[PDB]
Amino acid sequence: MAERGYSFSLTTFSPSGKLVQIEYALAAVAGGAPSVGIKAANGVVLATEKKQKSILYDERSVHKVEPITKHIGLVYSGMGPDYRVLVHRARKLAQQYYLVYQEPIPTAQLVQRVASVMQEYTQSGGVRPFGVSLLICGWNEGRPYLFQSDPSGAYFAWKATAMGKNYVNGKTFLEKRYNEDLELEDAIHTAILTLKESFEGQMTEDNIEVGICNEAGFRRLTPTEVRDYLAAIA
Amino acid sequence: MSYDRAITVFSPDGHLFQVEYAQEAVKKGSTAVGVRGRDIVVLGVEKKSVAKLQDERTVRKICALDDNVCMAFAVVASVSGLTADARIVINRARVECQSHRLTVGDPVTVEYITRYIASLKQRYTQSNGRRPFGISALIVGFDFDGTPRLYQTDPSGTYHAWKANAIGRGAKSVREFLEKNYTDDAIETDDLTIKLVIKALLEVVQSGGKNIELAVMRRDQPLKILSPEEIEKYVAEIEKEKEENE
Amino acid sequence: NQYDNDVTVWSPQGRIHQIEYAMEAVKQGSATVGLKSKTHAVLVALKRAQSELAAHQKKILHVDNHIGISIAGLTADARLLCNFMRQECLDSRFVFDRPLPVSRLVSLIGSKTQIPTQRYGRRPYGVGLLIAGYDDMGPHVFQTCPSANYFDCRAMSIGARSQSARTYLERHMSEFMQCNLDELVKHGLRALRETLPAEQDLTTKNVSIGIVGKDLEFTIYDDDDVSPFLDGLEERPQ
Amino acid sequence: DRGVNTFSPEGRLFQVEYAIEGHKLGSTAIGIQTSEGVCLAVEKRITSPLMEPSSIEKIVEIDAHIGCAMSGLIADAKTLIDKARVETQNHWFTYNETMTVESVTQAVSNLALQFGEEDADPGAMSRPFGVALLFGGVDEKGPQLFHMDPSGTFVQCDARAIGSASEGAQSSLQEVYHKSTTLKEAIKSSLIILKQVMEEKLNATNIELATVQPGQNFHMFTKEELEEVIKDI
Amino acid sequence: QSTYSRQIKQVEDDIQQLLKKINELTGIKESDTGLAPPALWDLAADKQTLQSEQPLQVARCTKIINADSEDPKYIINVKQFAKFVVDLSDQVAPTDIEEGMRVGVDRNKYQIHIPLPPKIDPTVTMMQVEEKPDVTYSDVGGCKEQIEKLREVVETPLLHPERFVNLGIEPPKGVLLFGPPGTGKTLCARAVANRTDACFIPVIGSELVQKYVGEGARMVRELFEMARTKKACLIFFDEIDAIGGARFDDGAGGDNEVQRTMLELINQLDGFDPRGNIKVLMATNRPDTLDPALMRPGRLDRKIEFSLPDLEGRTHIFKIHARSMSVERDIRFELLARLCPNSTGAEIRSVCTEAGMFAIRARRKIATEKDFLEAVNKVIKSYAKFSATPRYMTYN
Amino acid sequence: MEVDERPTEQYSDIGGLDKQIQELVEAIVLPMNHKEKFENLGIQPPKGVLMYGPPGTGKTLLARACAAQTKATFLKLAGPQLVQMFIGD
Amino acid sequence: MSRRYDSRTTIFSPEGRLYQVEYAMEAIGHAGTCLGILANDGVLLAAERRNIHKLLDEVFFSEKIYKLNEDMACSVAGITSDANVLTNELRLIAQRYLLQYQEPIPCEQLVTALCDIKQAYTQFGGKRPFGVSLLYIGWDKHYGFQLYQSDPSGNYGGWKATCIGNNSAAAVSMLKQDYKEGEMTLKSALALAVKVLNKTMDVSKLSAEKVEIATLTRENGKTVIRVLKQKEVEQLIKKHEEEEAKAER
């Protein structure tokens, strides 16, 4: 018939360069799942916590490592429903680029467009902005790239960053550590070790999920493979 | 126009909280005096806030709504600067003025603008998301009869014809200071009207003719905004004169 | 308080407090009696005026020459429903060409007046309508409330202590169908006084008469054109 | 906000009851219906001797044959007049007859109560109007004065006055005027109550009087003709 | 005046210092306050020192308990706040020692020497009742209908309960006073009190609510009981929007305080025994802003109308106010009354008085017609405007 | 609070609502005197009765009236009295 | 409920002005600073990014200064989030006006149009006004070289050297002190720009990663808008060392 309810601003400016209600959203991604992203400089590899901690996981396509398109993949930390819309929206955006350019959407561009809805939800009454942060990968310009889009809509540029449990501590360890000039196989080994540092508990292959982006294209690594990398390194 | 509370609720006073709050919002658009002559109807505004790294155009309380109607704003208060909320009333007022030029192509009437504005403020009450206004405008302009017009409107929704009116820093107070200065000679002499506007602004502002910018508008010619430099020459003589009437 | 102004707070009986207020609004408004026969429908309404140098406001309003309405309550709330009832009846007449039944029309009015009772932050209306109509079956007087709830009566009276008027009506219920146009008014007059104190009876200029049928076209009698219909009344039946 | 659905247990709105108090601070308007015309009186509110009575009016034209004088809150009157003016002109093309004084008053009366705190549209409001309007004009049924009020009710009146004290200004008018009388005596009767209820006293730039006869158009009075009506207070 | 003020400042300082020494030093200089008639009393006074019955200690009898074994037992509360049980007075009547009665008991033996006048059992209720003046009808404007009902409801049943029996109803337990403020309701109320010869006890609702609620409960009960002792009385509760406000309790607001005090008053209205011929009079803005819960309409009886003066109505008050005053006028009472808008009675009454203050300004000593004309114009604007809150958004 | 009867205001002050009167006289007065019967049938004597409704119906009117007439041991307790300004006293 | 709250977004407050508009200015204070300076043959924008982090990859090299058009440039002072929406509105307006006009977009015209949207939200719609003040730099023929400043309050200003973002009062005076009316040329002005950014930051140390510098210089027949690569800015960071001496002397 019609709906009203809540249509006045719910968000008030705090002197910090951010609003109060968005700041709270960033704590939400912190209590979210561990996800790590490191740019290997010959592809980008992104790794995420497979589990939602029930430890019955049986993945064959239900992943949180998802190809949007030919060379873009997304792994996230935070909310499930909020993420599904970003994935559906991302394909429409990538393709929007694919129609005009005949190449899909660069990392920078995809970020600008996803970011505008996340802010929209803030300023408006009767909505709340996402609780999701994205680790976005891509191969554009002849270089691998990795961007971080936060639940606010702000963007921070990162060659390596960590999300989930102990995210803050995660960023400083990466800032010092981050590597480049890595072979594909090595890319996986470094990524898994960084995931060990963020994520607690058991890792086997139904606890962590890995996806790689390189020249051939983004794909999502089979549960057998992840296991071989995990064992290999200290 | 979307909210989820009423914009105002009535009182047994018979005042509108939002219109009175708006009156202070329009004194943010500082003090403006306008006097009506025989052939040049003149308004002048307080503060240009010159620092010679700025432009003079951007701070204006003088706004051209058409090229033969112009207005300067305020009402009552003493509250802080800000051009902007007043500027918004101008942006509505300028469409309102322009739509009439489409309808009647001769120099459009002052009366039309003031009436539309009173009704415009009541209407905003009705919508829950719309912020009301309550301002005073010094409408200046010419008819198709070629006779001078200076009209003024109030937050009470009421417009009156006048030979001199001032608004700002106490609306009744700047107006009364002009009532003293007025004589019958003043309005026919072209020269005399200009001095009235400058004595009123010179009261609330320090070192005018840098904070006094005034425009004359004419029967045959459109809006002319005078340079400040030629206004300062007047301020020096006129301030001599201002002490005399007091 | 503010939990009684909310249209989203209810009693443990399951009654919204805002609907309850809205029924009373009628009751503070002046008494109107609406009766039917098998040839006519009569609307008798009690007037008011501001001054002795003034004529009284018709509480009988003109819709069509086959249907007519009488108001009791707030005039401004009345006028929105009035703009709605005129729009629907005229529609019916162009498209269907049937001299619209009363019974179909009131049910749609019931839908609209119900909408503010469900809305948050919007008040119900609070005017009572006795709608008189004449269709090919014969006359009906339907009464629609500030809620959906509508009545098909032979005679009804609504307003102050209206229960007492019904008693006179019930004693002469059968008679109404036999009686004439002239008498139906006189039986209305005799009901209308029961609502008011027994210290007072009606007068010529506080009575408005609205006559409906298709054996006659719609008429409003004001303050001095009331007199022919008025003669024949009994002073306070108890 | 604080309740704008507010009913008393008697069964009327508090908000409507609040609306009258606003009228009382505002301007004063007298409308008298005569057999020989309708005369309309209104307060101009002088406060400088520089405000020109010919150039500005508060007796305004609904049609070229119909006038309305306003009282109470000025902003509120303007909104009712602009919708009423168009309704009237549109009526004239269609019927080719002047609009009854009653016909225009009914339309404006719809706007007075329709308020509610939330679900508001232009046809609704956030608070009821506190203006009473005296619509006076001459039609084919003769000269009529219809009165519209803040409660959004229309009533025929042969004399109504509303102003500083609505009931007060009407009680002075009840003593003087008689129902059927000459134009000069009706014009005199309008001025006389007006100065006594007000703080302000009778002048020729203090008040504005315009008279509509039947068989005439609406005429707004000239400087001289306004001064002629002042000699008989 | 900077140099001139220092001189004056120093000269006072020195003179002032010297004064301190003189005052202290002189004193009363070893004199006796009693003088000559108390000398005989000194000898008495000494006999009393020897005596055990002097000094008495004031106490109050709290409760009547019988398990009698000497002469009737009563428990009194001593003002050192030790409870002691004492026995029937040494020679005075048992009918003088009652519950809630004051008694003088010996300091050394603790038995009732003599009973004393009653009541000192609450501390707070005694404080809450204040002074009583009388103003008469002359001084209070109007002889109107609104004025007339106040008398008929209050004066007639209390003065003669006979009239009220004849009709076949009881003299009101309750009575309701309503009308907006600034009309002289309190003034009218004082005026009927003298005629009736019915004592009026004024009470303030603002004292009743307090931080911790319970004090106001005991106060209200104690207050009814005191009034009950008085015969043909009125308890007039003025300026109440506690026992006078809206029915609602938030449950973390000052609204809790209101609800306990109201709730005991309901118990009192019915009574432990009924209250035939006892009136409580309550002032509210209008009866629709008063509880449907505290208002249990049979007991409250008549609601007496007072309403905001009309234009005709204010013409009437103004003749009374003017006539009472000493004024020399040429202009008439009706003109000036029509001059005023519908606002309040209070502006129009102030005109009569303001014309007298303009006379001192004018350099007369009594008013004149021109002072009168000046007073209407300033007064209408001044009092009405420059007041009231500029919000009625976001309240309960 | 200590026993001493509270007066009758009579049940023949309220006509109608007869059914309701029967429930009050049975409930309150009978288990007090006639505890033996409440035990005989097999029930405990009540821990009380709550009288609720809209103001002025006679909820209090019946209880006080009936209790005096029958003769009962009457304690006079008032809820607001019990609350005090000293904390938990 | 919703009727028992305050936030005074569309409703005027006791102040005579809305809370939401005044609060937006506070958020702008603790976010990265943007300045525009005037030169004789160009105009330039210099900005501090919202990233205080020690490691940036440069995925998007516009994280503060976005070049809208080939005739215009903007900066962001405030929250990057409200900027994202605004950036997309600007790429359309700036190019639309140009399709019609065939003349480099006037700096004034752009801001007044934009400011109208900023005020629209606060007045109606029940949305808060954007937490971003945008600093527009452009060139049109009839004013010359320009800098205009945009607010959430719908206030515009015609400037020759101004700064908005963090510690703005200091910043505008510092730009006035070093740079008078029409004094300094484009190259020497780029140095001046970095010098004020080094002093005024939310968090100290000025680096290539923390700064982005943009030039409007009119080339041979076209007005060229470029965002300088990290490499070029670095040559200006040493130039900014030289500039500190030069202001004093």
Q: What is the CATH number of the domain that holds C154?
A: 3.60.20.10
d(CA C187, CA C175): 10
Tokens of B233: 């020459």
Question: In this structure, are residues D168 and D210 in contact, taking their beta carbons and an 8 Å threshold?
Answer: no
SS3 of D2, please?
A: coil
Please give the residue range of the domain that contains residue B105: 2-239
Residues on chain G touching B58 (C-beta within 8 angstroms): 108, 148, 156-158
d(CA D8, CA G9): 31
Contact flag B2-G124 (C-beta cutoff 8 Å) = yes
User: Among candidates B57, E96, B157, C150, which has minimal Cα distance to G156?
Assistant: B57
Please give the residue range of the domain that contains residue C18: 1-234
Question: In this structure, are residues G160 and G128 in contact, taking their beta carbons and an 8 Å threshold?
Answer: no
d(CA C236, CA C238): 6
Residues on chain E touching G14 (C-beta within 8 angstroms): 390-391
Please name the residue ranges forming H helices in chain D: 14-19, 21-25, 74-95, 101-109, 166-176, 183-197, 223-231
Q: In what order do the strands lie in the sheet with E56-64?
A: E83-87, E73-77, E56-64, E102-106, E112-115
B157 touching D (Cβ < 8 Å): yes
Residues on chain B touching E391 (C-beta within 8 angstroms): 17
Query: Residue G47: beta bridge partners?
Result: G34, G212
Contact flag D126-B128 (C-beta cutoff 8 Å) = yes
- The dihedral over CA atoms of E298, E285, E188, E270, expressed in degrees to the nearest 10, equals 30
The count of C-alpha atoms lying within 13 angstroms of the C-alpha of E216, restricted to the half-sphere facing its C-beta, is: 24
Question: In this structure, are residues C16 and C118 in contact, taking their beta carbons and an 8 Å threshold?
Answer: no
Q: For C1, name the nearest residue in chain E, comparing CA atoms only.
A: E396
Query: Residue B54: beta bridge partners?
Result: G159
Nearest C-alpha of chain D: how many angstroms from G152?
Answer: 26
Question: In this structure, are residues E348 and D172 in contact, taking their beta carbons and an 8 Å threshold?
Answer: no
Q: What is the DSSP code string of E150-161?
A: HHHHHHHHHH-H
E276 touching F (Cβ < 8 Å): no
* Chain G interface disruption, residue of A6, A11, A13, A139, most G CBs within 10 A: A13
Tokens of B83: 């051009």
d(CA E170, CA E151): 17
How many distinct structural domains can be found in chain C?
Answer: 1
SS3 of G132, please?
A: strand
d(CA G193, CA B238): 45
Contact flag B84-G159 (C-beta cutoff 8 Å) = no
* Chain C interface disruption, residue of E247, E248, E395, most C CBs within 10 A: E248
E370 CB contacts (<8 Å, ≥6 apart)? E362
Q: What sign does the dihedral A15-A17-A21-A24 (CA atoms) show?
A: negative
How far from each other are the two terminal CA atoms of chain C, in whole angstroms?
Answer: 41
**Strand E174-178 relative to strand E279-284, pairing:** parallel
Residue E186 assigned ligand-binding role: yes
d(CA E289, CA D9): 10
Residue E72 assigned ligand-binding role: no
User: Among candidates A165, A162, A156, which has minimal Cα distance to A177?
Assistant: A162
Q: What sign does the dihedral E307-E310-E313-E314 (CA atoms) show?
A: positive
User: Among candidates E319, E378, E385, which has minimal Cα distance to E354?
Assistant: E378
Locate the DSSP E strands across chain C.
32-36, 41-46, 60-62, 67-72, 128-134, 139-144, 150-153, 155-158, 207-212, 219-221
- Give me the phi and psi of G147, to 5 degrees please: -140, 135
Q: In what order do the strands lie in the sheet with A35-39?
A: A160-162, A35-39, A44-49, A208-213, A219-220
CATH classification of the domain holding G50: 3.60.20.10
E394 touching G (Cβ < 8 Å): yes
Question: In this structure, are residues E367 and E356 in contact, taking their beta carbons and an 8 Å threshold?
Answer: yes
Tokens of B223: 């809006």
Contact flag D1-E342 (C-beta cutoff 8 Å) = no
Locate the DSSP E strands across G79-143.
132-140
Residue E119 assigned ligand-binding role: no
Residues on chain G touching B132 (C-beta within 8 angstroms): 12
Place of tokens 């009846």: C89
- The dihedral over CA atoms of B130, B136, B138, B139, expressed in degrees to the nearest 10, equals 40
CATH classification of the domain holding A146: 3.60.20.10
Question: In this structure, are residues B210 and B228 in contact, taking their beta carbons and an 8 Å threshold?
Answer: yes
Question: In this structure, are residues G212 and G47 in contact, taking their beta carbons and an 8 Å threshold?
Answer: yes
Query: Residue B20: beta bridge partners?
Result: none
d(CA D219, CA D213): 9
Nearest C-alpha of chain A: how many angstroms from C14?
Answer: 22
- The dihedral over CA atoms of F11, F12, F13, F17, expressed in degrees to the nearest 10, equals 70
Question: In this structure, are residues E105 and E113 in contact, taking their beta carbons and an 8 Å threshold?
Answer: yes
Q: For B129, name the nearest residue in chain A, comparing CA atoms only.
A: A8
**Residue G39 domain-assigned?**
yes
* Chain D interface disruption, residue of G3, G6, G11, most D CBs within 10 A: G3
Residue E244 assigned ligand-binding role: no
SS3 of G8, please?
A: coil
How far from each other are the two terminal CA atoms of chain G, in whole angstroms?
Answer: 64
E108 CB contacts (<8 Å, ≥6 apart)? E52
Residue E184 assigned ligand-binding role: yes
Q: How many CB atoms lie within 10 A of CB C233?
A: 18
d(CA C170, CA C164): 10
**Residue G2 domain-assigned?**
no
Q: In what order do the strands lie in the sheet with G211-218?
A: G161-164, G34-38, G42-48, G211-218, G223-227
**Contact of chains G and C by CB distance (3 or more pairs under 8 angstroms):** yes
**Residue G149 domain-assigned?**
yes
E99 touching F (Cβ < 8 Å): no
Q: What is the DSSP code string of G151-209?
A: -TTS-EEEESEEEESSSHHHHHHHHHHH--SS---HHHHHHHHHHHHHHS-SSS---TT
The CATH code of domain D1-233 reads: 3.60.20.10
**Strand E303-304 relative to strand E174-178, pairing:** parallel
SS3 of E294, please?
A: coil
d(CA B122, CA E248): 35
d(CA E328, CA E238): 36
G11 touching E (Cβ < 8 Å): yes
Residue B37 CA, chain-centre distance (Å), reads: 16
d(CA G192, CA G211): 13
Rg (CA), chain C: 18
User: Among candidates B41, B33, B101, B35, which has minimal Cα distance to B66?
Assistant: B101
Place of tokens 């605004």: G86
Burial E7-35 (b: 16+ CB within 10 A, else e): eeeeeeeeeeeeeeeeeeeeeeeeeeeee
Residues on chain D touching B154 (C-beta within 8 angstroms): 74
**Residue B244 domain-assigned?**
no
Contact flag G160-B24 (C-beta cutoff 8 Å) = no
How many distinct structural domains can be found in chain B?
Answer: 1
For residue F44, the 8-state DSSP code is P
Question: In this structure, are residues D1 and G3 in contact, taking their beta carbons and an 8 Å threshold?
Answer: yes
Please give the residue range of the domain that contains residue G237: 19-247
C84 touching D (Cβ < 8 Å): no
Residues on chain A touching C121 (C-beta within 8 angstroms): 4
SS3 of E382, please?
A: helix
For residue E342, the 8-state DSSP code is S
Please name the residue ranges forming H helices in chain F: 18-24, 30-33, 35-41, 59-70, 79-82
How many distinct structural domains can be found in chain G?
Answer: 1
d(CA C66, CA C41): 10
Contact flag G55-A12 (C-beta cutoff 8 Å) = no
**Residue G148 domain-assigned?**
yes
Question: In this structure, are residues A151 and A29 in contact, taking their beta carbons and an 8 Å threshold?
Answer: yes
**Residue G176 domain-assigned?**
yes
E389 CB contacts (<8 Å, ≥6 apart)? none
How many distinct structural domains can be found in chain A?
Answer: 1
Contact flag D168-E310 (C-beta cutoff 8 Å) = yes
d(CA B82, CA D5): 37
d(CA E183, CA G100): 73
The count of C-alpha atoms lying within 13 angstroms of the C-alpha of A61, restricted to the half-sphere facing its C-beta, is: 0
- The dihedral over CA atoms of G227, G230, G231, G235, expressed in degrees to the nearest 10, equals 80
d(CA D65, CA D81): 15
* Chain E interface disruption, residue of B9, B16, B24, most E CBs within 10 A: B9
Question: In this structure, are residues B25 and B85 in contact, taking their beta carbons and an 8 Å threshold?
Answer: yes
C28 touching D (Cβ < 8 Å): yes
E388 touching B (Cβ < 8 Å): yes
A73 CB contacts (<8 Å, ≥6 apart)? A46, A65, A66, A67, A137, A211, A213, A218, A220
Please give the residue range of the domain that contains residue A116: 4-232
d(CA G82, CA D17): 46
Using CB atoms, which residue from E288, E341, E380 is nearest to D10?
E288
Which amino acid is it at E304? I
Q: What sign does the dihedral E103-E106-E111-E114 (CA atoms) show?
A: negative
d(CA B93, CA B97): 6
Please name the residue ranges forming H helices in A11-151: 20-30, 80-101, 107-123
The length of chain E, given as a count of residues: 396
Residue E182 assigned ligand-binding role: yes
Distances (CA, A) of C121 to A200, D9, D110, D129: 51, 18, 20, 19
For residue C54, the 8-state DSSP code is B
Using CB atoms, which residue from B6, B9, B13 is nearest to E388?
B13
CATH classification of the domain holding B193: 3.60.20.10
Contact flag A108-G60 (C-beta cutoff 8 Å) = yes
Q: For E249, name the nearest residue in chain C, comparing CA atoms only.
A: C1
